[PDB]
Amino acid sequence: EVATYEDLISHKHDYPKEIYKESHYIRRNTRLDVIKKIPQFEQKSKEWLKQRTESLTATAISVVFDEDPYKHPIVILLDKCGRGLPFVENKFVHHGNKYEQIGTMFYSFRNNVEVGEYGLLQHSGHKFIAASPDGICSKKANTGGLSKLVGRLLEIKFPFSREINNSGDLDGDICPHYYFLQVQTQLYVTEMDECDFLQCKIDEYDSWEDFVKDSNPIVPGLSKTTNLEKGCLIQLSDKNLIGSDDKEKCLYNSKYIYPPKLHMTNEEIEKWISSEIMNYHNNDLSENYMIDRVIYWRLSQVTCNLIKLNKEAFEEKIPLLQQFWDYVLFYRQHSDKLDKLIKFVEKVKEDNSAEIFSYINEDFLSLNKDSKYEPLYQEETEWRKKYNQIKAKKAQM
Amino acid sequence: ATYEDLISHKHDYPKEIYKESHYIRRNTRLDVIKKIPQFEQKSKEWLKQRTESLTATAISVVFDEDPYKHPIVILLDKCGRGLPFVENKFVHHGNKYEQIGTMFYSFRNNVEVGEYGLLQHSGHKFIAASPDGICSKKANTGGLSKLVGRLLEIKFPFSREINNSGDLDGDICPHYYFLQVQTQLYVTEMDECDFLQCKIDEYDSWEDFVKDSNPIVPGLSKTTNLEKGCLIQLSDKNLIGSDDKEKCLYNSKYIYPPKLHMTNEEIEKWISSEIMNYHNNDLSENYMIDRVIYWRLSQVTCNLIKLNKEAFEEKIPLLQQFWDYVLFYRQHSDKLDKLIKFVEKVKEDNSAEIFSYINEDFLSLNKDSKYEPLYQEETEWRKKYNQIKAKKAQMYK
Secondary structure (H helix, E strand, O other), X not given: OOOOHHHHOOOOOEEOOOOOXXXXXXXXXXXXXXXXXXXXXXXXXXXXXXXXXXXXXXXXXXHHOOOOOOXXXXXXXXXXXXXXXXXXXXXXXXXXXXXXXXXXXXXXXXXXXXXXXXXOEEOOOOOOEEEOOOEEEOOEOOOOOEEXXXXXXXXXXXXXXXXOOOOOOHHHHHOOHHHHHHHHHHHHHHOOOEEEEEEXXXXXXXXXXXXXXXXXXXXXXXXXXOOOEEEEEEEEEEOOOOOXXXXXXHHHOOEEEOOOOOOOOHXXXXXXXXXXXXXXXXXXXXXXXXXXXXXXXXXXXXXXXXXXXXXXXXXXXXXXXXXXXXXXXXXHHOHHHHHHHXXXXXXXXXXXXXXXXXXXXXXXXXXXXOOOOOOOOOOOOHHHXXXXXXXXXXXXX | OOHHHHOOOOOEEOOOOOOOHHHHXXXXXXXXXXXXXXOOOOOOHHHHHHHOOEOHHHHHHHOOOOOOOOHHHHHHHHHOOOOOOOOOHHXXXXXXXXXXXXXXXXXXXXXOEEOXXXXXXXXXXXXXXXXXXXXXXXXXXXXXXXXXXXXXXXXXXXXXXXXXXXXXXXXXXXHHHHHHHHHHHHHHOOOEEEEEEEEEEEOOOHHHHHHOXXXXXXXXXXXXXXXXXXXXXXEEOOXXXXXXXXXXXXXXXXXXXXXXXXXXXXXXXXXXXXXXXXXXOHHHHOXXXXXXXXXXXXXXXXXXXXXXXXXXXXXXXXXXXXXXXHHHHHHOHHHHHHHHHHHHHOOOOOHHHHHHHHHHHHHHHOOOOOOOOXXXXXXXXXXHHHHHHHHHHOOOO
């Protein structure tokens, strides 16, 4: 049974020796140390911004493949040329950005491994391919020494309304296809083998009293209703949006202070919250954000499915990405042709990818006589068909 | 040596029932005040009470004995043609720490202090006062108190320095405050008032706060040998994020600690509890949690002021005349407009001509009245204030 919280720590992945013996553990560990020491620049500023303009992110890969249900490839090309829509904050990103770190903490504790986060990483061979993994498991086991999970990527998703499918295809049902391709790109860029896809559902208590009432008697960190971890959060509101009737916009721009660890006793929580408040006027966040309220949460559902890298299947599609990127670099040096392109895309709408990229390919070949490039998206992909089938089902009601 | 040695028992009453006449009268009078109906402040009949009476702060001005305002300002204020009040640093400072003064007095003098709203004299309903507090019969350590019915007046001067010796009517207690206390004693029908003046400075952080704790009496400061504690500052949602930060600061509200000499654990527990349940505090609807303030008492003086009943009742006919002028211009709007025009012709400080004109306006519709013009000669305090203004305004020396 579970006497203390230490019995919840899985030791299935502990490594017996003090030095890796198997080839794949050695390679994954060495690769991880090479991923470390890679220069990562101060976020939101200077060369960090430069890094994003020279590469496609992993979220764009599913769209350039004409296999995304929400966006079409032209949106990515225009976005990378500086003529894209500004981003409006919504409820989905808010929920995911709010609890992502809680997922990381749960995974690190239950699987007994340290998880580090790293910024945008570019592929050594194809610098225009970049990814930002949520975390990569280090060699260090939280309790003992080494872990068999070294170099395993971690992807945490907190679906706002979508319900987690437990069985079916891994590429379609259990993991949505657009996320699956994102994981594949992250694995290719990091040069790692496997990634744990973690999907979680969370619900929130009404007050501090309900939080204390749900505590397991001797293991306070567990919930009595869901038998999973629970804890606290400090929500901070934006000073620029604090005084408005548009409250959703204020909520979606909130920042959060996260607890130091899981399975804190109630006194440890109270001491932590008091410490954050009593020293908040010395927190840089105090210049732009104000203390709103305390959030009380408990985990309700956690699924974890392993995703492995299919190297050849990804490298078969690299010529497509190289061609698309050549179009991006093309319209970055010809502003006039870009203006005419935007006119044409407004003429024939976004979803008609065949005619759009036929025009783009002819525009490209006009200044590249010897180019062997042929137009893209001449046929709809099968995932494009499947998504169009779903759109047709929805539009009938 | 613990904090219990700071509690004075000089004012404890030995018997379980008051024997002396003045204790009996003050106790009975106080119990009569507790049953006086007090209406919801800032709303409904509260506003009605303010229109029917002169507050105690206006009395020093109506006597032509105030250094800041002149008598005409009160008449125009009571008729609805006065300036709006702009919040400033002095009122902010006093309203910020008044409660801390009350707590210090209650602790050191071993008496419970109750607060009561605006009270009218019943004999002269147009005379009203709102005392900061009145000491009840109950001693904190059990039993009766000799301080029953004693008024409490707390002043936290921002820049004015506290004079320790000299005249009570001029030096120790500023004359305008003295007249305010006299009116409060007359309205409540009590005998004595403790005039408390306090100076405060604030620590930079919680670490400095704990370092300044006296070794053997932790609730006392080591540098100033007086009490120290905490406050929770709350900012207005409507003025937060504004370009005027001073205006936002002066409109802040505060949550006060339950007691003095709290241990560090008790402070941390109090702050954590106040934060976690702030969404169940009605103040959260309009105010948000700003920061924690750490304060220590640096100087405290206390001087007893007794009521001069005859000296106050000599000035009641003047107040009745002034109020008759107010009620007069409340039913004759046209004469009020012409009056404001006349006050623009000659300035506010020329009380003689203004109230000579007012007396002529009054007698025009009240032929028999026996009223004579007011402020025809300058009072002795008016002379002294003009002397000080002249000293400041001179070019040489």
